């Protein structure tokens, strides 16, 4: 049941069917390239893409660095028939990896039946294909055949790791936003991937490896296939819809470019950045686009440029857009059918959900930026497999995502040089004469994401008219593996559209790519004058350059920032004195033991508080580590948190702007009792919604403006902890190298073993820090944000009570005999509050999942788990050690364990 049923080799000769030299649409003349049809409607061209866009045809690095965090340039890459053969095989393998998942199997099928609409006709009685949605397949006899296609995978342009969907346009039409769709060209490579940092999984995986992890390329391709899917169905969000950020403040990013489309594609929390009002706007926008396509089809009385029948064609599009067809043959769009389909394309196909299916380590948000680039080879099975990716079953690589740990799995990952320079794009932060200015550069992607307030729009202040008829929007349930299973089991895998004979296009197909909006390169090296040391300074002070000299820890941030041999520590002065002391060889091991103990002790410290509600634990050293808030003793931090709440953690206090809510106006029905009572019930139903809307809104403003600040603080604490380990190691390693060959020979000292120990201590520390910071973020929601919403809601309930009573009394004639019972319904309903339940609006907060993580944590620490299963005694751990059973071993028949 494979997706690609031929196994191609790049040197296979052209057959004119699935292997040919082909012409894609182009502005001017384009040189034919060798392509492979790996599936119906899907082609692969193993070539660096200089053809798609003749404008940028040169594979060299640009004059000015791109403003991304990671980029790589090699002009020679993919110039060889061998590399071409490997590209083809890698891409194919990734298609197969995706297809082998329930989610991927749907996506791939959706893409195939996602045939670009025939909108070519300027006469609406006729149905015609659009030219730029086709290619010309050159035959062995020199003739070309015109053939329509959905998807082409091509090699990357000058920037090897920049992957994107490209497609051709129309003189007037926007094919990606009008529901028509257009053939999608994806720049991709399976021969490289990104490195990233992950501290979150330590909760369930306390043994998580150190250093960078590699993105599973299958996730990356899937990401682009999702874009492709939107673009084919003409539902992509306009590229001028972007999430604006505040760049003016010293702590804010100089600039960041991210689009609603990308947010939609990532899924998870990123997609919850887009508020309900706008998510609605889109759904309606494309629904009407779909409705338009229905009316275009309905008035088409004949087909042109094919031997296929109008019947067959109209049916192709009925199956693509899920159209309802009455007894006459007229098409319309069922809001129910459409909602289901648009939901699958935008909420089911998401990077987040693919990760759930692949079971790989992946960035939880786009705000966890790629820190590195890596050369890989996934073609050999000993490296990467369709089922397991890099994390190979029944081996060390299967545990704790080791397959993706670049250091543990180092043979599969070769570190390349990031073309994006050191401090290429930064801000310059300077403290004032605390003796003259001490300035440091801060990497743009080390700064704070602070979304612009004009990102969150709401109709909350708009009133409504309640009506006997007015009816209720549904619950709008969250996406879950079982809902996906619902779509899956109802999905139709049978009917792929045929590859039809179409009238031959001209030898060259004329067209240009859709224009992308020009984005202002954001400012560089903005300078800032500050009165107080910042978080960025405190963290920078924890760094050192390698060298032969002995570094010392200091408790003075000032000293540390001023001298290359001085590294700041948030550990106690006792630790400082001890790690710095010149240590005799005979005492070296015991010294190290003590240092490892002290390290683990200080980083494991947790103060419990019984005083406050939502925050049970506090990690006190966060204060001196990041200079959170101010003053001196860590007892000040514990104290300030207990007193002021979570707000002391925030870099900026977010605006939460919740207006006076729009009141209800009820339409009166004279003498009609049943209508008058329904209107009353509807106003109460819509009131329950007003509460849910206000809660969704706040949750949305919190994910974007607050939980992102806390996620940064968290990432920085891991950076702090790693720096402390590096420093301590460097000092220990210096001490060892001071010894004589003879002294060393009597000290068995393994720096890799010591490193491994400190990395475990850092993990334990991150577990606590993670819990503390989660409680902190949530506490701020419960206590500092939600209440503004609840006040606006209670004022709304009060107004509605007065209105509803007035409506009842004015209508006492119609309502006679029922007046008392209705008063009670109104007074009782509106005197209650609807409690905010966080578990309702976001995935990670259910109570059970806390116990779930605890069970995982113990199971993932089991390196041998020996059970009797089926007929054999085996190892149920991910290492799957072999078991040899003697002939005289006896197993209890009643319980064979």
């Amino acid at each position: 049941m494979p997706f690609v049923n031929k196994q191609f080799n790049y040197k296979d000769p052209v057959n004119g069917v699935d292997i040919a030299y082909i012409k894609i649409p182009n502005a001017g003349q384009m040189q034919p390239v060798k392509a492979f049809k790996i599936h119906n409607k899907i082609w692969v061209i193993p070539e660096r893409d200089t053809f798609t866009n003749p404008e940028e045809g040169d594979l060299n690095p640009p004059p000015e660095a791109k403003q991304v965090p990671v980029s790589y340039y090699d002009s020679t890459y993919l110039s060889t028939d061998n590399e071409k053969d490997n590209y083809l095989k890698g891409v194919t393998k990734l298609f197969e990896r995706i297809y082998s998942t329930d989610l991927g199997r749907m996506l791939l099928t959706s893409i195939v039946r996602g045939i670009p609409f025939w909108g070519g006709s300027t006469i609406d009685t006729e149905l015609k294909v659009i030219d730029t949605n086709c290619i010309n397949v050159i035959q062995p006899d020199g003739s070309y055949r015109s053939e329509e296609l959905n998807l082409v995978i091509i090699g990357p342009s000058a920037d090897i790791i920049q992957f994107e969907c490209k497609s051709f346009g129309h003189e007037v039409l926007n094919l990606t936003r009008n529901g028509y769709g257009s053939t999608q060209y994806i720049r991709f490579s399976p021969d490289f991937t990104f490195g990233f940092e992950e501290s979150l999984e330590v909760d369930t995986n306390p043994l998580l490896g150190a250093g960078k992890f590699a993105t599973d390329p299958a996730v990356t391709l899937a990401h682009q296939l999702i874009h492709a899917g939107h673009r084919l169905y003409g539902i992509a969000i306009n590229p001028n819809r972007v999430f604006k950020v505040n760049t003016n403040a010293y702590y804010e990013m100089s600039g960041l470019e991210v689009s609603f489309e990308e947010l939609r594609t990532f899924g998870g929390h990123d997609a919850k950045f887009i508020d309900s009002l706008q998510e609605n706007e889109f759904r309606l926008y494309y629904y009407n686009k779909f409705k338009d396509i229905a009316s275009t089809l309905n008035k088409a009385k004949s087909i042109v440029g094919t031997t296929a029948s109008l019947q067959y064609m109209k049916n192709v599009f009925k199956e693509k857009y899920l159209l309802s067809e009455d007894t006459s043959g007229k098409f319309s769009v069922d809001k129910l059918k459409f909602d289901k389909l648009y939901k699958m394309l935008t909420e089911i196909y998401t990077e987040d959900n693919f990760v759930k299916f692949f079971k790989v380590l992946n960035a939880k948000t786009f705000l966890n930026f790629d820190k590195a680039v890596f050369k890989i080879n996934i073609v050999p099975k000993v490296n990467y497999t369709i089922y397991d990716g890099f994390n190979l079953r029944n081996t060390n690589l299967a545990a704790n995502f080791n397959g993706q740990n670049t250091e543990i799995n180092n043979m599969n990952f070769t570190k390349l040089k990031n073309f994006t320079g050191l401090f290429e794009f930064y801000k310059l932060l300077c403290v004032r004469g605390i003796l003259n200015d001490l300035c440091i550069k801060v990497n743009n992607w080390d700064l704070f994401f602070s979304p612009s307030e004009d990102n969150f729009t709401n109709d909350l202040n708009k009133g409504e008219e309640i009506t006997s008829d007015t009816n209720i929007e549904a619950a709008e349930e969250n996406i879950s593996l079982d809902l996906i299973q619902q779509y899956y089991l109802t999905f139709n895998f049978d009917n792929e559209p045929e590859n039809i004979s179409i009238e031959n296009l001209s030898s060259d197909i004329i067209g240009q790519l859709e224009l992308m909006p020009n984005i202002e390169r954001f400012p560089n090296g903005k300078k800032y004058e500050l009165d107080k040391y910042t978080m960025f300074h405190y963290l920078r002070a924890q760094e050192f350059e390698h060298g032969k000299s002995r570094i010392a820890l200091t408790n003075s941030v000032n000293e540390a920032l001023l001298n290359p041999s001085r590294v700041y520590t948030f550990f106690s002065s006792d630790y400082v004195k001890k790690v710095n002391k010149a240590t005799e060889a005979a005492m070296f091991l015991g010294w190290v033991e003590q240092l490892v103990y002290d390290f683990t002790d200080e980083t494991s410290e947790v103060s419990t508080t019984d005083k406050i509600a939502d925050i049970t634990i506090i990690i006190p050293y966060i204060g001196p580590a990041l200079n959170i808030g101010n003053m001196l003793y860590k007892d000040d931090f514990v104290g300030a948190l207990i007193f002021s709440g979570a707000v002391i953690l925030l870099e900026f206090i977010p605006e939460i702007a919740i207006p006076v809510l729009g009141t209800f106006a009820l339409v009166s029905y004279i003498a009609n009792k049943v209508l008058t009572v329904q209107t009353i019930d509807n106003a109460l139903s819509k009131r329950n919604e007003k509460w849910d809307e206000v809660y969704k809104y706040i949750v949305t403003n919190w994910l974007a403006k607050v939980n992102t600040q806390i996620d940064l603080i968290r990432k920085k604490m891991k950076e702090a902890l790693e720096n402390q380990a590096e420093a301590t190691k460097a000092i220990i390693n210096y001490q060892y190298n001071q010894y004589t060959e003879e002294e060393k020979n009597n000290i068995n000292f393994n720096i890799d073993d010591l490193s491994s120990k400190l990395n475990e201590s850092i993990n334990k520390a991150m577990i606590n820090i993670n819990k503390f910071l989660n409680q902190c973020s949530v506490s701020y929601l419960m206590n500092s944000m939600i209440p503004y919403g609840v006040k606006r809601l209670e004022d709304f309930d009060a107004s509605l009570k007065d209105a509803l009573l007035k409506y009842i009394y004015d209508n006492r004639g119609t309502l006679i005999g029922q007046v008392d019972r209705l008063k009670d319904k109104v007074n009782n309903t509106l005197s209650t509050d609807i409690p905010f339940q966080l578990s309702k609006y976001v995935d990670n907060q259910r109570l059970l999942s806390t116990f779930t993580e605890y069970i995982k944590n113990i199971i993932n620490t089991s390196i041998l788990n020996l059970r009797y299963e089926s007929n054999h005694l085996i190892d149920l751990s991910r290492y799957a050690s072999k078991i040899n059973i003697g002939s005289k071993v006896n197993f209890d028949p009643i319980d064979k364990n």
Epitope: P13, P140, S143
Partner: nanobody
Amino acid sequence: SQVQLVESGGGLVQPGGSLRLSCAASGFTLGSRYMSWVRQAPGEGFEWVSSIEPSGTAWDGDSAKGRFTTSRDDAKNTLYLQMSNLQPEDTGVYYCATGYRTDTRIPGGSWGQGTQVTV
């Protein structure tokens, strides 16, 4: 009738000034197809020489770029190849072939009988 391809050129000059090869086609309109030039040296495989599009555009391989210019005359239905600055490593039999970048004998393709070149 059928598809016929016939090359014409003598192929003798010592290194090395110039030569104009010719291919007369019948059965089809020359300008409606992708055509190629390819040579086979004594005791050796095929090498892609040139290619010409219906659009009249001409692409040339590593061999003889900045040397040969591929051309056509539609009324005379004949494919021309203009060679210059020839060397001894250019020796072999020159076939006018049916595809784009035709490197090989492909079922369905048409060829000439070959034209000798000794330099």
